[PDB]
UniProtKB/Swiss-Prot annotation:
Transmembrane segments: none annotated. Highly expressed in the central nervous system. Also found in skeletal muscle and at low levels in pancreas. The lineage of its organism: Eukaryota, Metazoa, Chordata, Craniata, Vertebrata. It comes from Homo sapiens (Human). Signal peptide: none annotated. It is linked to Spastic ataxia Charlevoix-Saguenay type: A neurodegenerative disease characterized by early-onset cerebellar ataxia, spasticity, retinal hypermyelination, pyramidal signs, and both axonal and demyelinating neuropathy with loss of sensory nerve conduction and reduced motor conduction velocities. Other features include dysarthria, distal muscle wasting, nystagmus, defect in conjugate pursuit ocular movements, retinal striation (from prominent retinal nerves) obscuring the retinal blood vessels in places, and the frequent presence of mitral valve prolapse. This is Sacsin. The ubiquitin-like domain mediates interaction with the proteasome. Co-chaperone which acts as a regulator of the Hsp70 chaperone machinery and may be involved in the processing of other ataxia-linked proteins. It is found in: Cytoplasm.
C-alpha cells in the first residue's frame, strides 16, 4: 500500500513476481539481467546512473503517482525497442489457459527490477510506458500504461512533472519531445519509499553503491561473455545536480 502491503489478498500477478524475486534474490543479478537484455537488443553500450533528483508532484497522472517522483536508478542502452519488445515487456506474465502464470515474451530477467521499484518506466523511440503489476495506478485490470510522444503529445504536455524525469539525461531534451523520438532505450526505476505487496526492500544510496561495487568485482568476467556490448559505465547524479563517473569497463 503501504497500507495494502499487509492483511490483504495477493493478486496472482504479484504472487508470480514474488516467486521470481525469491529465485533471483541478489541485487547483483538485476544488473547482469539488464546487461544481457541490452546484448540481446544488439546495444553496444550500457550506462547505469543513480539519480538523487527529486521531481515535483503538481502535474502528475494522479496524486497516487507522487511516491515515484524521487531518486531512481536509470539504465541506458543505444538500441531502440521494436514493436515486439513493447508488446513483450507489457506482458508481465502469461496465462495460456485460465494454469499457473508463466514468464511472458520478454523473458524472466527484467522482472528482477522489482527488487528495487514497484513502477518500472521505459522510454524508447516514440513511446514511454510505466508498468504497475499491483494494478492500482491506471485501472483495476491494467498492469501498465503507455504514452506515444506524437499521439499523446497534448497529454504529455499537461503532465509536465510526470514527464520531467525523462528529459535532461542520456541526451534527452525538450527537443526529444517536440521531435517525438528518443534514439535509444532509457529505463527509470524509482526507488521504493515504503513496503508494497511485492517487496519490503527500500534501497538508498549506500545500497545502490554496494550494487555498483559488486558489479565492479565481476565486470571483466561479464564482458568476456558479451559480443555486442563493449562498454559499461556507472554514474551518480547528486541531489544538487553534480554528476560523477563511478566506474567504466570496456571490452574487445
Amino acid at each position: 500500500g503501504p497500507l495494502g502491503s499487509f492483511g490483504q489478498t495477493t493478486p496472482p500477478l504479484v504472487d508470480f513476481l514474488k516467486d521470481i524475486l525469491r529465485r533471483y534474490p541478489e541485487g547483483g543479478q538485476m544488473l547482469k539481467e539488464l546487461i544481457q537484455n541490452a546484448e540481446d537488443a544488439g546495444a553496444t553500450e550500457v550506462k547505469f546512473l543513480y539519480d538523487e533528483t527529486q521531481y515535483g508532484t503538481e502535474t502528475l497522472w494522479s496524486k497516487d503517482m507522487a511516491p515515484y517522483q524521487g531518486p531512481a536508478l536509470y539504465v541506458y542502452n543505444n538500441a531502440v525497442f521494436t514493436p515486439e519488445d513493447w508488446h513483450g515487456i507489457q506482458e508481465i506474465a502469461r496465462s495460456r489457459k485460465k494454469d499457473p502464470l508463466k514468464v511472458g515474451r520478454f523473458g524472466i530477467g527484467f522482472n528482477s527490477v522489482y527488487h528495487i521499484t514497484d513502477v518500472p518506466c521505459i522510454f524508447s523511440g516514440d513511446q514511454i510506458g510505466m508498468l504497475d503489476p499491483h494494478q492500482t495506478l491506471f485501472g483495476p485490470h491494467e498492469s501498465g500504461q503507455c504514452w506515444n510522444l506524437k499521439d499523446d503529445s497534448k497529454e504529455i504536455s499537461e503532465l509536465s512533472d510526470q514527464f520531467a524525469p525523462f528529459v535532461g539525461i542520456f541526451g534527452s531534451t525538450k527537443e526529444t519531445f517536440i521531435n517525438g523520438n528518443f534514439p535509444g532505450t532509457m529505463f527509470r526505476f524509482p526507488l521504493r519509499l515504503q513496503p508494497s505487496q511485492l517487496s519490503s526492500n527500500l534501497y538508498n544510496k549506500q545500497m545502490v553503491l554496494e550494487l555498483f561495487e559488486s558489479f565492479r568485482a565481476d565486470a571483466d568476467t561479464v564482458l568476456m561473455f558479451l559480443k555486442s556490448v563493449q562498454d559499461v559505465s556507472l554514474y551518480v547524479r547528486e541531489a544538487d545536480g553534480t554528476e560523477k563517473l563511478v566506474f567504466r569497463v570496456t571490452s574487445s
